[PDB]
Amino acid sequence: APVRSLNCTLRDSQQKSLVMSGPYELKALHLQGQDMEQQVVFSMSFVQGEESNDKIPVALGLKEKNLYLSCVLKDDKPTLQLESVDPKNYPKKKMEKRFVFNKIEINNKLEFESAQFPNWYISTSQAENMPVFLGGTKGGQDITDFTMQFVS
Ligand SMILES: N[C@@H]1CCCN(C(=O)CCC(F)(F)F)C1
Structure with a gap:
């Protein structure tokens, strides 16, 4: 069938x-108030890969990009890079491994581990x-935990 996707935002x-x-x-x-419209909306696709109850392979595309x-x-x-793809072919269920993250849920927080590079994580700095x-x-000092907000 088609790949399944959800619109969402992430915060560290x-x-x-x-x-x-x-x-x-x-x-x-x-960010808070009017400036929050600047945040990126993701389409989180649920892709092929090794899966368990709390570790779910996803791709993170920018919504309708x-x-x-x-x-x-x-x-x-x-x-980590943003990478351009052929819009005719994406998203798809069998995303290439460089695009796959393991979304891990521990203690009401999410981590996104690279499927390609074990124990490498989407990270932010403490600095603005x-x-x-x-x-x-x-x-360590960098942030590897996030929350998701669902978007219409
Ligand atoms: N000043 C920096 C140079 C390296 C790449 N940079 C990114 O913002 C990549 C973001 C992400 F999410 F794609 F990794 C900017």
Whole structure:
């Protein structure tokens, strides 16, 4: 059948919102009131991959954009990028592994682990207006926990 998808927003565990601020640029900042319209709306697709009760493979596309978060090596490091795709072919159920995140639910928070790079996670900095990135631990000073808000 078709791939199933939900519209949503994400906030980090400091309640920082995610916004587009430049070509293929994604930043986290504290937002409230009118400025909240700036936040990115995702289409979260439920994709093929290894799955358990609390670990669900997803892709994260920008709503009605042919842009997906993906994990690739850049200058020999696992990195997070926005990647353009052919809009005729996406989303699909069998997303390529660079696009797949394991959405993990622990203690009412979500983590998004790269399926391609085990124990690398979508991460934000504690500082305001810094890039969203792929970080090589769910430990330390950077933030690896999120909440989802469902969008109409
Ligand atoms: N100043 C930085 C240079 C590296 C890439 N940057 C991103 O914002 C990537 C965001 C995400 F989510 F795609 F990873 C900007």
